[PDB]
Amino acid sequence: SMRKTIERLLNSELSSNSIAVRTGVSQAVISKLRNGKKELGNLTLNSAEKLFEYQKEMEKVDTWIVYRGRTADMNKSYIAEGSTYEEVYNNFVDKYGYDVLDEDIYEIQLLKKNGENLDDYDVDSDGINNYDKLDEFRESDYVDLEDYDYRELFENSSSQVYYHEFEITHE
Amino acid sequence: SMRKTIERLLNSELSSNSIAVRTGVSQAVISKLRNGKKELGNLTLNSAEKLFEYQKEMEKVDTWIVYRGRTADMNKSYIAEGSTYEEVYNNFVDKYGYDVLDEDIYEIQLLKKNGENLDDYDVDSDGINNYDKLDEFRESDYVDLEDYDYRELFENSSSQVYYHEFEITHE
C-alpha cells in the first residue's frame, strides 16, 4: 500500500475514530501515526492495505449512466438509469418489462460469450427456435454475462428499440 | 508494496541470505515467511517495500502491458502497450488521440485524487465545464497522477470504450 496515499488519508480532516471505524484499523494506531509516535513504515502490511484501499475509494471517480432508447417510428421513447450497465438493464425491465428488447437477447448474448454457434440454436427474429439445445446448454457449465454484455443487450436489439444512446457522467 | 510481487520473490528459487544482502531484510524474516511462521500481512511496510522494490527492478526489463479496448463496433477495437500503465496511456493517445476516452477523464481523475469537489467544476456528461477553476487548479500546487491512475483512466471510461482488458507479464 503506497505511503503517499496513506499520508493523504492521515492528513485529511477525517477524525481518527472515523478512520478507525471505516477501515478496521485501531484509533490508537491512527493517533500514533498522526502524532509521530508510530512511523508509517512500522504499520503492518494488512493495516497499510486497509488504509490505502479506503483512501483509494475516497478518491475513486464515480460513474452514472443514462440510457435513451427510441423506436424506429420514433413514437415511443425509453429512459433507464444506473451506475452499471446491469443496473440500467434492471431499471429498464422494471419500467418497461422484459418483452421490449429483442427476443432471447440475454440467452443469445450468453451463447455468443461462450463461443457457441447461432446455426445450432436456430436463432431467429422471433427468437431461439431450437429450445432443447438451449436447455442442455444451461445444464452445461458456462461463463456468466459480464457488465459490458448488458450494454450489448440494448445495442444487439433492433426489433422494437432501434436507436440506443448511452450518456455517461463522472460528476 | 504489492503482495503478488513479494510472493513471487519468496516462491521463486533464491537464497534468503542472497535476498538479505540484496534487500537488507533480515534472513530470519524471509525464512519465517517461507515456512509460514510469519504471515506476509504481519510484515512491516518498511520490509515489504524493500522486498517489492527489489523484485520490481529485477522484473523491470521483462515487464510489458498490453491493453485491449472493446467498442460497440466489433470490427473497431483499441490496442495500447507499454512497460507501465502511463506508457500504455501515452501509446493509446499517440495512436488514437485524446477524444476516445471519456470526456476530460484525465483531469477529473486528477481533481478527485487531489480532494477537489467536482460541483465547483460544473462536471457533466460533456466533461468539465468551468474552465476558469480548472486553470486555477493547473496553476495550483497539486499531486500528479500515480501509475495505477492511468489504468483507472481506461477502467472508468464507458462512453466509447466500455470493456477494458490488461495483459501483464508480471516478470
Numbering used by the authors:
A (entry chain D), B (entry chain B): 0 to 170
What does the paper say about this structure?
AcrIIA15 is an anti-CRISPR (Acr) protein that inhibits Staphylococcus aureus Cas9 (SaCas9). The AcrIIA15 protein, consisting of 170 amino acids, is comprised of two domains: an N-terminal domain (NTD) from residues 1 to 56, which contains a HTH motif resembling a transcriptional repressor, and a C-terminal domain (CTD) from residues 57 to 170. AcrIIA15, by combining the HTH domain and Cas9 inhibitory domain within a single protein, exhibits dual functionality as a bi-functional anti-CRISPR protein capable of both transcriptional repression and CRISPR-based cleavage inhibition. Our structural and biochemical studies demonstrate that AcrIIA15 functions as a dimer to simultaneously inhibit both anti-CRISPR operon transcription and SaCas9-sgRNA DNA recognition.
The bending of dsDNA upon binding to AcrIIA15 prompted us to investigate whether AcrIIA15 undergoes conformational changes upon binding promoter DNA. To address this question, we obtained the crystal structure of free AcrIIA15 at a resolution of 2.34 Å. However, due to the different relative positions of the CTD and NTD structural domains in the two monomers, the structures of the two monomers in the same dimer are different. Structural superposition of the AcrIIA15 structures in the free and DNA-bound states showed that they have similar structures, suggesting that DNA binding does not induce significant structural rearrangement in AcrIIA15. The crystal structure and biochemical assays in solution reveal that the full-length AcrIIA15 adopts a dimeric form, while its CTD alone remains as a monomer in solution. The main dimer interface is formed by the loop connecting helices 3 and 4 within the HTH domain, which involves multiple hydrogen bonds and hydrophobic interactions. A hydrophobic core is composed of specific amino acids, namely L44, I5, L8, L9, L32, L39, L42, and L50, from both monomers. Additionally, helix α1 contributes to dimer formation, with residue R2 from one monomer establishing hydrogen bonds with the sidechains of N45 and E48 from the opposite monomer.
